[PDB]
RNA sequence: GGAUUGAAACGCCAUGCUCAGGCUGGCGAGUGGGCGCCACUCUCCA
């Protein structure tokens, strides 16, 4: 694995003075090694329902979105 | 169309199982033993 994220660049300076940009993986402390303990065989059934929020407009209805969800889930 | 302690994340670069050595020297298959005793092609038609 990697040790750090990419910083924000400045476009205008980039072509106002042409320079290369990159992150070099292989160099020194950049390289990081991480282990993982994980599950192997899973299966779940989850019960959840629906609710409108304050941002919602007056035309919104929970039932319509629920039906859309059902259609999509059936179709895959 | 904001958000799964999430969104990104190589085990990588390369290294002879090698040099060499006899299965060799030599030893008899050999001494000697009867295929023997005896048996009708024979009785007819110019």
Shape: flat
Beta content = under 5%
Separate helix tally = 2
Q: How many strands?
A: 0
In percent, how helical is the residue content? 25-40%
Alpha-beta classification: mainly alpha
Largest sheet: none
Task: Report the radius of gyration as a whole number of Å.
Answer: 24 Å
Terminal CA distance: 34 Å
Task: Give the topology string: H per helix, E per strand.
Answer: HH
PDB class: dna binding protein/dna/rna
Keywords: CRISPR, type I-C, Cascade, ssDNA target, DNA binding protein, DNA BINDING PROTEIN-DNA-RNA complex
Entry title: type I-C Cascade bound to ssDNA target
Name: pre-crRNA processing endonuclease
Provide structural commentary:
Belongs to the CRISPR-associated protein Cas5 family. Subtype I-C/Dvulg subfamily. The protein has helices spanning 11-16, 62-75. The protein has 76 residues and is an all-alpha fold. The structure holds one RNA strand of 46 nucleotides.
Task: Give the SSE map.
Layout: H1 11-16, H2 62-75
The structure holds one RNA strand of 46 nucleotides.
Organism: Nitratidesulfovibrio vulgaris (strain ATCC 29579 / DSM 644 / CCUG 34227 / NCIMB 8303 / VKM B-1760 / Hildenborough)
Protein name: pre-crRNA processing endonuclease
Family: Belongs to the CRISPR-associated protein Cas5 family. Subtype I-C/Dvulg subfamily.
């Amino acid at each position: 694995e990697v040790s750090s994220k990419i910083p924000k660049p400045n476009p205008a300076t980039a072509m106002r003075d042409r320079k290369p940009l990159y992150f070099l993986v292989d160099d020194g402390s950049n390289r990081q090694q991480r282990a993982a303990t994980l599950l192997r065989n899973v299966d779940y059934v989850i019960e959840a329902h629906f609710e409108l929020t304050d941002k919602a407009g007056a035309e919104d209805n929970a039932g319509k979105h629920l039906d859309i969800f059902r259609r999509r889930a059936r179709a895959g």
